[PDB]
Amino acid sequence: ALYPDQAQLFSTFDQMDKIGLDPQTMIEADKQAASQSREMRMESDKAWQELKNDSRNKDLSRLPTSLDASARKVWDSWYYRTGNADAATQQTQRWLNENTVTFQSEGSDGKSIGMVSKHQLMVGDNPESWQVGRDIIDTARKQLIKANPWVVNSQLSVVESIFLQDATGTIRIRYDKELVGKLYREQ
Amino acid sequence: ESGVRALGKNLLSYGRQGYDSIEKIINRWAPPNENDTKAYIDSVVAATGIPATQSLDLSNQDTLSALAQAISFHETISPKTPPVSANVVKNSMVGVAIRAGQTEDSLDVIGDVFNPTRWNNHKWTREELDQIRNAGVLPQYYGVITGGSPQNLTELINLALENQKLDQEKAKAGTGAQLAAGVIGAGVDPLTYVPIAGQVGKGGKLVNKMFTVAAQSGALAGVSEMARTSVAGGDAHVAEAILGGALFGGGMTAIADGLGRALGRFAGPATRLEARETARNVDGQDLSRLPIQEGEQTFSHQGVKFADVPNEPGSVRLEDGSILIGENPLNPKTRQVFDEVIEPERAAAGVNLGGLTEIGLKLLRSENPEIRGVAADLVRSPTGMQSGASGKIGTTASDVFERLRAVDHRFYNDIDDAVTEALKDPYFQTAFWRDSGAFRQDIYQRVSMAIEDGSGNLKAELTPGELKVYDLLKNQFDAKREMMENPAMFGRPDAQSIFPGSRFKGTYVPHVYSSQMKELYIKELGSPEALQEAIKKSWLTSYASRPEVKKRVDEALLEADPTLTPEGLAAAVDKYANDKAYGISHTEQFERSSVMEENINGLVGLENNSFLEARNLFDSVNNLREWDMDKIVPAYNRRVNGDIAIMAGTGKTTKEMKDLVETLMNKAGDDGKTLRDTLKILTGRARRDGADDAAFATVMRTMTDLAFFAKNAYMGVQNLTEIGGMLARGNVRAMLHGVPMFRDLAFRNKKVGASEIKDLHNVIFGKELDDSIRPSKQDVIDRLRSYSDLGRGAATALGTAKYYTGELAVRSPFTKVLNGTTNYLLDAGRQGFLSDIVEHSLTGSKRRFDDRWLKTAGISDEQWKGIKSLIRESVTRGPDGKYTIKDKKAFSQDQRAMDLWRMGDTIADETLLRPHKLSNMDAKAYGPIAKTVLQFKNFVIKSINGRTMRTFYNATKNNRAMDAALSTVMSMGLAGMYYMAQAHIKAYAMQDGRDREYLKQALNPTMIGYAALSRSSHLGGPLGVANILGGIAGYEDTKMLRSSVGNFLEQVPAFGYAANVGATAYNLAGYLKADTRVNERDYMTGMYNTFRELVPNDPITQKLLLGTFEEQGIHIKD
Amino acid sequence: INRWAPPNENDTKAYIDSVVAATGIPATQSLDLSNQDTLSALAQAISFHET
């Protein structure tokens, strides 16, 4: 999010540590593809929209407005590095789903109602502290629905700061990190 | 002056010898072989605007006084050489920091960006415009062409075509189509989005994926071929106006959040609007509703129920759970609080109209047979509905009145859209040497002159955009006369004709004469007789020249006089023309003041119809006429409709129905037991002050039925009004942080004392004084602005050659580059100075007056003495501090009023608008309005020098958008100021401590926003809300008749009202066989027309406003 | 339906399909209760489910 103009380097970094590729092969794969450029039209401002408005792609359909810049670059890098136009729509989803957090409703059906990032939820400096904000948010939502027995007739969601809001604009809440940390230390 | 006065003469001699540029003058002034003359050129180019190589013209004051001032500075306590005046440890680094800087002259923003001294002044011919029209350039690319020279036309056309092609390719790529998916949730970044011009008619809509199920809205039917699409008038333009509103709302929310989060402390309406539009477009659930529970308190006002909303003060909920913000024009609570506590004098009773219905019901309940005999014919009793005892004969007055009043408003709604479209021809957009306010008068004058011509050569000159106006006006003007000649078309076979003179054929256009031009010509010719003989001879020439005039006059004369003499014509013609000339040169019956006078107390003028004795047999006199149809057509229509209705219903002329009242009242001496009121309301003479409030009240009262029998219109209306309210709120928030006088007046707690009430009341009196005297014609304004230039300095060559009275380039470049914005500031300053002149004339003070004003304006002794005498004669000032004028009609009919107005205008213009740069202003003292004007000008100058405006101008050389974007903020802030002043004046008189509560209620920001939006000049334009939205009274009039079932209705004639070709629905046939009920189209069209210039169907203006407000910041409250 | 039977207490998921299938109107689409065709249809499809 801080430097969203060279996200291809992060794509290079991820596979050297999660999958197990050695650097030499991916060095050779770029050099071999220098001669031929696919460029079957595709990359434009038109293909992106008609790809992002399909119910088939469950993860790309919802996206924080702060992560559009790098998703395009990861998609482009994978399409350039390989030939598939449908193996490049899957690695993007894997990266996105490994960087974010999803919330779900309490009914039998499990439609998602939000998506946030794993640094708007950290509480301290321990790099595994993002699992507390999720519990706090869940408890807040469940205790807030019961206070007003008419919220179920509109849509309560978690929109990325991180807010809780209706479709009527009446209920609006904000999540502050410093207050949560200060209270948690005392507790 | 009082300075320099030597470099001016030196430069005069230099320019007489023939020196062009800066380089030559400077090199002669300081030889290059001795001292630099390289950094001495940049310091002059930067502080004046003209580049070094470019040519000059040392015969213009703007290029003379500017250059003299930028030289004397460089030749020659004071902290750091301050150019401006008052009225308008060292070791570490401090010593080096201060001791190293050097002062330089201030910049000139206007010249640096636009560079308006390179613009040529050439009047294009017909072929040079036909070439442009045949090339095929769109209206938004005329910026490149304007100002060019005749030699370089083809290259400019090529440049415009190349830009057009590049934009077309970019739009094909699919670049500016991300706004259809919305802003809330996932979408564009509101502050980092730049639109593309040219996609106005492609056809788009808003659909947000966060509020729908994917099965309900399946997918997209691809995209347009981008080579075929077209759109209609108003059915597919609302869906893009709302697209613009969404962008504005998202941007405002983004700015406010950042400010709030930074400091440590617009989010409801945006979400509600997007939910409503998405639910409307795909026929789904409306998720933006909050129903009323049980056991909760409710109220009602004027038959409409509502209840409060929690957590958001000022809003309200309707019966079905629709929420409206506190600034909407339809809010039932704000009108209640106004009429209750704030403005009781303009109570709902003062603005109530009931219509003919209740008056008719009250009239029919009488006992006097003489009154009932005419009552049974005047009004239509409700005792019918297949059970009526009588009334079967035919149409009464009510039916014809309602039919005609129902068709006229549709006519107005069409003429507005016809005229607005004509002003985008290349003829008008490329002429920068004329004011932008006279275009409508130009159009009306040309068309009206072309109608009365018989040859036809004048008709061949009109542009392809004026023929439709021609057709509409001709058809209606023929239909009205056709009705007036035979009033038996409606059902009564014993009615005569009222048209005076009906043997021959022609088209009649109303004649209304001016008065200021009469006064000017009388002054120049010396006597009132010379005008009479000039008129007589200008009439007599047409008799000799044309044959048809000879035939008409001869036939009418021989019919009039039984005696026939071949010698008698040379006497009859003259003895007929003489008295007609005398009727104009020696009285005031046909002037605009009497014919169109505002209000009358009773029936005073019904004896004679002044609109119809202006007709003549003859065919310069056209110099004394008026060509402003937007105010002249409706009054003519009202009077004529009244006359036709009375005659076709009763069988008596209006004079008979008038004198019947006094004939009856002559026997009313005895104290025994509304005919007057019925006649007054039928003729069209009832007071119509503040009809806009009634126009909105009608919609507020009948909204529910519309919601019942139609759905799309309901949500469209809601969204339009909410966008308007949001814009008003944003503007007030910015203005609070901007201008100090606004902040001073808006943050008070108690009653102000002693001094300031006098200034607060001069502020009020200035507006009335200016409004009662301002001329109503363009030529008078041109001549009055022309004398003052000759009052200071001109030459013989100026009188000859081109010059011409049309004058906008002679003014400063500020008027050329941004013309629309300047009129508001000028009209504020004029009213500012008029009150100071009056106060000095009465009290003899000297704290504001200055004796250099007489020499600057160009007033000699006699004019000043006359002005002083008149003001001392006609105006008195009280110990309270309120000005009163004894006589109003006679005061505005003297020669001296023009002198006074001219003095005020020229002084204001020269002192406040001419001198650019803040270091060039010298003044003794400043008043309450001078500070406001200066601060608004400072706001503008800050806005232009930004980054967004510079980048936009560099990309496309389109300067027409900036003026339109920047006019609205003036239009609203000035509107707010007088409301605040009036409230402060009113709260002074409360003796007890009630003023604290009154000020707490009156000075809330939401009330300020409401009063700023309702007031001002959005209206519908020159026509007005009372005319555009005044057609829905028929629904209420027809509801109340039966209530106080059935209406199965005859089958509509096969030719439905949906299919009617335009310009042919208004002739005689279209009036007699039309449908006169209300459908959703009227609602949608009227609502769109009322809010046209505030919410256009293009997104550039919203982006410009958003960028400015980002860069300057808004007040965060809290 | 949600006002008639709160979602937390008892299902209200298979109780919606039984009404959408026996009437025609999909779940999200808007209604117009002023029409008798859309009124008498809904009254009959609820009373059966109660008993």
PDB file of N, CA and C in Angstrom, chain B residues 493-546:
ATOM      1  N   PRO B 493     -73.877  31.257 -29.603  1.00  0.00           N
ATOM      2  CA  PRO B 493     -74.024  31.815 -30.953  1.00  0.00           C
ATOM      3  C   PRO B 493     -74.464  33.271 -31.019  1.00  0.00           C
ATOM      4  N   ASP B 494     -74.409  34.043 -29.938  1.00  0.00           N
ATOM      5  CA  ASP B 494     -74.750  35.461 -29.994  1.00  0.00           C
ATOM      6  C   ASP B 494     -73.627  36.330 -29.432  1.00  0.00           C
ATOM      7  N   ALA B 495     -72.390  36.026 -29.806  1.00  0.00           N
ATOM      8  CA  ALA B 495     -71.224  36.780 -29.373  1.00  0.00           C
ATOM      9  C   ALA B 495     -70.579  37.472 -30.566  1.00  0.00           C
ATOM     10  N   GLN B 496     -70.250  38.751 -30.397  1.00  0.00           N
ATOM     11  CA  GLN B 496     -69.658  39.562 -31.445  1.00  0.00           C
ATOM     12  C   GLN B 496     -68.136  39.488 -31.368  1.00  0.00           C
ATOM     13  N   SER B 497     -67.463  40.325 -32.153  1.00  0.00           N
ATOM     14  CA  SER B 497     -66.010  40.348 -32.228  1.00  0.00           C
ATOM     15  C   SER B 497     -65.449  41.568 -31.511  1.00  0.00           C
ATOM     16  N   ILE B 498     -64.220  41.433 -31.016  1.00  0.00           N
ATOM     17  CA  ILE B 498     -63.567  42.474 -30.234  1.00  0.00           C
ATOM     18  C   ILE B 498     -62.286  42.985 -30.876  1.00  0.00           C
ATOM     19  N   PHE B 499     -61.845  42.391 -31.978  1.00  0.00           N
ATOM     20  CA  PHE B 499     -60.622  42.833 -32.636  1.00  0.00           C
ATOM     21  C   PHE B 499     -60.885  44.120 -33.406  1.00  0.00           C
ATOM     22  N   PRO B 500     -60.172  45.207 -33.119  1.00  0.00           N
ATOM     23  CA  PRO B 500     -60.432  46.484 -33.796  1.00  0.00           C
ATOM     24  C   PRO B 500     -59.719  46.554 -35.138  1.00  0.00           C
ATOM     25  N   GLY B 501     -60.485  46.415 -36.216  1.00  0.00           N
ATOM     26  CA  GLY B 501     -59.932  46.438 -37.557  1.00  0.00           C
ATOM     27  C   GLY B 501     -59.621  45.035 -38.035  1.00  0.00           C
ATOM     28  N   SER B 502     -60.475  44.474 -38.892  1.00  0.00           N
ATOM     29  CA  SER B 502     -60.376  43.063 -39.237  1.00  0.00           C
ATOM     30  C   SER B 502     -60.583  42.787 -40.718  1.00  0.00           C
ATOM     31  N   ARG B 503     -60.482  43.799 -41.576  1.00  0.00           N
ATOM     32  CA  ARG B 503     -60.732  43.570 -42.993  1.00  0.00           C
ATOM     33  C   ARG B 503     -59.567  42.844 -43.654  1.00  0.00           C
ATOM     34  N   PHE B 504     -58.335  43.246 -43.349  1.00  0.00           N
ATOM     35  CA  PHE B 504     -57.190  42.711 -44.067  1.00  0.00           C
ATOM     36  C   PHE B 504     -56.487  41.633 -43.245  1.00  0.00           C
ATOM     37  N   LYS B 505     -55.344  41.177 -43.749  1.00  0.00           N
ATOM     38  CA  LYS B 505     -54.620  40.055 -43.176  1.00  0.00           C
ATOM     39  C   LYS B 505     -53.195  40.459 -42.823  1.00  0.00           C
ATOM     40  N   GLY B 506     -52.643  39.783 -41.824  1.00  0.00           N
ATOM     41  CA  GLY B 506     -51.285  40.044 -41.393  1.00  0.00           C
ATOM     42  C   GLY B 506     -51.014  39.358 -40.073  1.00  0.00           C
ATOM     43  N   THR B 507     -49.808  39.592 -39.564  1.00  0.00           N
ATOM     44  CA  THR B 507     -49.385  39.080 -38.268  1.00  0.00           C
ATOM     45  C   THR B 507     -49.125  40.257 -37.342  1.00  0.00           C
ATOM     46  N   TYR B 508     -49.702  40.212 -36.144  1.00  0.00           N
ATOM     47  CA  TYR B 508     -49.605  41.308 -35.192  1.00  0.00           C
ATOM     48  C   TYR B 508     -48.616  40.957 -34.090  1.00  0.00           C
ATOM     49  N   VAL B 509     -47.688  41.868 -33.818  1.00  0.00           N
ATOM     50  CA  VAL B 509     -46.707  41.724 -32.751  1.00  0.00           C
ATOM     51  C   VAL B 509     -46.839  42.938 -31.843  1.00  0.00           C
ATOM     52  N   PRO B 510     -46.945  42.763 -30.523  1.00  0.00           N
ATOM     53  CA  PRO B 510     -47.275  43.894 -29.644  1.00  0.00           C
ATOM     54  C   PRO B 510     -46.240  45.010 -29.676  1.00  0.00           C
ATOM     55  N   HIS B 511     -46.724  46.243 -29.528  1.00  0.00           N
ATOM     56  CA  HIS B 511     -45.898  47.444 -29.551  1.00  0.00           C
ATOM     57  C   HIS B 511     -45.852  48.057 -28.157  1.00  0.00           C
ATOM     58  N   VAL B 512     -44.647  48.202 -27.607  1.00  0.00           N
ATOM     59  CA  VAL B 512     -44.441  48.838 -26.309  1.00  0.00           C
ATOM     60  C   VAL B 512     -43.277  49.807 -26.445  1.00  0.00           C
ATOM     61  N   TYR B 513     -43.503  51.076 -26.123  1.00  0.00           N
ATOM     62  CA  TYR B 513     -42.507  52.113 -26.343  1.00  0.00           C
ATOM     63  C   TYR B 513     -41.755  52.441 -25.060  1.00  0.00           C
ATOM     64  N   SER B 514     -40.507  52.863 -25.227  1.00  0.00           N
ATOM     65  CA  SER B 514     -39.633  53.210 -24.120  1.00  0.00           C
ATOM     66  C   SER B 514     -39.781  54.686 -23.774  1.00  0.00           C
ATOM     67  N   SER B 515     -39.137  55.091 -22.683  1.00  0.00           N
ATOM     68  CA  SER B 515     -39.212  56.467 -22.197  1.00  0.00           C
ATOM     69  C   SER B 515     -37.860  57.156 -22.102  1.00  0.00           C
ATOM     70  N   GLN B 516     -36.809  56.436 -21.707  1.00  0.00           N
ATOM     71  CA  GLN B 516     -35.484  57.042 -21.648  1.00  0.00           C
ATOM     72  C   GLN B 516     -35.022  57.499 -23.026  1.00  0.00           C
ATOM     73  N   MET B 517     -35.279  56.698 -24.061  1.00  0.00           N
ATOM     74  CA  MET B 517     -34.914  57.119 -25.408  1.00  0.00           C
ATOM     75  C   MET B 517     -35.703  58.349 -25.827  1.00  0.00           C
ATOM     76  N   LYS B 518     -36.969  58.423 -25.424  1.00  0.00           N
ATOM     77  CA  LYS B 518     -37.752  59.619 -25.702  1.00  0.00           C
ATOM     78  C   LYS B 518     -37.121  60.841 -25.055  1.00  0.00           C
ATOM     79  N   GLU B 519     -36.674  60.709 -23.803  1.00  0.00           N
ATOM     80  CA  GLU B 519     -36.046  61.836 -23.118  1.00  0.00           C
ATOM     81  C   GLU B 519     -34.746  62.254 -23.796  1.00  0.00           C
ATOM     82  N   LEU B 520     -33.930  61.282 -24.209  1.00  0.00           N
ATOM     83  CA  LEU B 520     -32.673  61.612 -24.878  1.00  0.00           C
ATOM     84  C   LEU B 520     -32.915  62.335 -26.199  1.00  0.00           C
ATOM     85  N   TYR B 521     -33.852  61.839 -27.006  1.00  0.00           N
ATOM     86  CA  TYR B 521     -34.118  62.496 -28.280  1.00  0.00           C
ATOM     87  C   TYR B 521     -34.715  63.879 -28.073  1.00  0.00           C
ATOM     88  N   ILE B 522     -35.578  64.036 -27.071  1.00  0.00           N
ATOM     89  CA  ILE B 522     -36.137  65.353 -26.791  1.00  0.00           C
ATOM     90  C   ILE B 522     -35.032  66.322 -26.404  1.00  0.00           C
ATOM     91  N   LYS B 523     -34.071  65.865 -25.598  1.00  0.00           N
ATOM     92  CA  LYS B 523     -32.952  66.729 -25.237  1.00  0.00           C
ATOM     93  C   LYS B 523     -32.145  67.134 -26.461  1.00  0.00           C
ATOM     94  N   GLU B 524     -31.898  66.195 -27.375  1.00  0.00           N
ATOM     95  CA  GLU B 524     -31.039  66.519 -28.513  1.00  0.00           C
ATOM     96  C   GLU B 524     -31.732  67.432 -29.516  1.00  0.00           C
ATOM     97  N   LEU B 525     -33.027  67.230 -29.757  1.00  0.00           N
ATOM     98  CA  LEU B 525     -33.714  68.047 -30.753  1.00  0.00           C
ATOM     99  C   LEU B 525     -34.282  69.341 -30.182  1.00  0.00           C
ATOM    100  N   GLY B 526     -34.396  69.458 -28.864  1.00  0.00           N
ATOM    101  CA  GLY B 526     -34.717  70.713 -28.224  1.00  0.00           C
ATOM    102  C   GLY B 526     -36.183  70.958 -27.943  1.00  0.00           C
ATOM    103  N   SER B 527     -37.091  70.257 -28.616  1.00  0.00           N
ATOM    104  CA  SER B 527     -38.509  70.503 -28.411  1.00  0.00           C
ATOM    105  C   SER B 527     -39.266  69.191 -28.509  1.00  0.00           C
ATOM    106  N   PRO B 528     -40.427  69.085 -27.860  1.00  0.00           N
ATOM    107  CA  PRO B 528     -41.279  67.910 -28.079  1.00  0.00           C
ATOM    108  C   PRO B 528     -41.949  67.887 -29.441  1.00  0.00           C
ATOM    109  N   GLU B 529     -41.983  69.007 -30.166  1.00  0.00           N
ATOM    110  CA  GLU B 529     -42.617  69.011 -31.480  1.00  0.00           C
ATOM    111  C   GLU B 529     -41.757  68.320 -32.532  1.00  0.00           C
ATOM    112  N   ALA B 530     -40.450  68.587 -32.525  1.00  0.00           N
ATOM    113  CA  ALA B 530     -39.565  68.014 -33.531  1.00  0.00           C
ATOM    114  C   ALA B 530     -39.704  66.501 -33.593  1.00  0.00           C
ATOM    115  N   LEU B 531     -39.896  65.860 -32.441  1.00  0.00           N
ATOM    116  CA  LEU B 531     -40.152  64.425 -32.435  1.00  0.00           C
ATOM    117  C   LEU B 531     -41.439  64.096 -33.181  1.00  0.00           C
ATOM    118  N   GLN B 532     -42.478  64.913 -32.998  1.00  0.00           N
ATOM    119  CA  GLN B 532     -43.749  64.651 -33.662  1.00  0.00           C
ATOM    120  C   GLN B 532     -43.599  64.711 -35.177  1.00  0.00           C
ATOM    121  N   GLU B 533     -42.941  65.755 -35.688  1.00  0.00           N
ATOM    122  CA  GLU B 533     -42.768  65.809 -37.143  1.00  0.00           C
ATOM    123  C   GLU B 533     -41.829  64.726 -37.667  1.00  0.00           C
ATOM    124  N   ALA B 534     -40.792  64.353 -36.916  1.00  0.00           N
ATOM    125  CA  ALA B 534     -39.944  63.257 -37.375  1.00  0.00           C
ATOM    126  C   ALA B 534     -40.742  61.966 -37.502  1.00  0.00           C
ATOM    127  N   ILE B 535     -41.569  61.665 -36.501  1.00  0.00           N
ATOM    128  CA  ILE B 535     -42.398  60.466 -36.562  1.00  0.00           C
ATOM    129  C   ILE B 535     -43.360  60.545 -37.738  1.00  0.00           C
ATOM    130  N   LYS B 536     -43.982  61.708 -37.939  1.00  0.00           N
ATOM    131  CA  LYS B 536     -44.969  61.836 -39.005  1.00  0.00           C
ATOM    132  C   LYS B 536     -44.348  61.579 -40.372  1.00  0.00           C
ATOM    133  N   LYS B 537     -43.171  62.151 -40.632  1.00  0.00           N
ATOM    134  CA  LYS B 537     -42.559  61.957 -41.945  1.00  0.00           C
ATOM    135  C   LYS B 537     -42.079  60.523 -42.133  1.00  0.00           C
ATOM    136  N   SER B 538     -41.520  59.920 -41.077  1.00  0.00           N
ATOM    137  CA  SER B 538     -41.090  58.532 -41.193  1.00  0.00           C
ATOM    138  C   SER B 538     -42.271  57.600 -41.421  1.00  0.00           C
ATOM    139  N   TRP B 539     -43.467  57.991 -40.979  1.00  0.00           N
ATOM    140  CA  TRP B 539     -44.658  57.227 -41.340  1.00  0.00           C
ATOM    141  C   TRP B 539     -45.081  57.481 -42.781  1.00  0.00           C
ATOM    142  N   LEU B 540     -45.038  58.742 -43.218  1.00  0.00           N
ATOM    143  CA  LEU B 540     -45.563  59.091 -44.534  1.00  0.00           C
ATOM    144  C   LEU B 540     -44.752  58.472 -45.662  1.00  0.00           C
ATOM    145  N   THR B 541     -43.458  58.222 -45.448  1.00  0.00           N
ATOM    146  CA  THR B 541     -42.650  57.692 -46.550  1.00  0.00           C
ATOM    147  C   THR B 541     -43.145  56.328 -47.040  1.00  0.00           C
ATOM    148  N   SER B 542     -43.624  55.476 -46.130  1.00  0.00           N
ATOM    149  CA  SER B 542     -44.032  54.127 -46.511  1.00  0.00           C
ATOM    150  C   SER B 542     -45.267  54.132 -47.400  1.00  0.00           C
ATOM    151  N   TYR B 543     -46.190  55.069 -47.176  1.00  0.00           N
ATOM    152  CA  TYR B 543     -47.331  55.232 -48.072  1.00  0.00           C
ATOM    153  C   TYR B 543     -46.886  55.382 -49.518  1.00  0.00           C
ATOM    154  N   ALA B 544     -45.955  56.298 -49.770  1.00  0.00           N
ATOM    155  CA  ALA B 544     -45.509  56.538 -51.136  1.00  0.00           C
ATOM    156  C   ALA B 544     -44.730  55.352 -51.686  1.00  0.00           C
ATOM    157  N   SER B 545     -43.888  54.724 -50.862  1.00  0.00           N
ATOM    158  CA  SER B 545     -43.023  53.672 -51.393  1.00  0.00           C
ATOM    159  C   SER B 545     -43.808  52.416 -51.773  1.00  0.00           C
ATOM    160  N   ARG B 546     -44.731  51.904 -50.833  1.00  0.00           N
ATOM    161  CA  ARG B 546     -45.344  50.598 -51.061  1.00  0.00           C
ATOM    162  C   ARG B 546     -46.751  50.733 -51.636  1.00  0.00           C
TER     163      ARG B 546
END
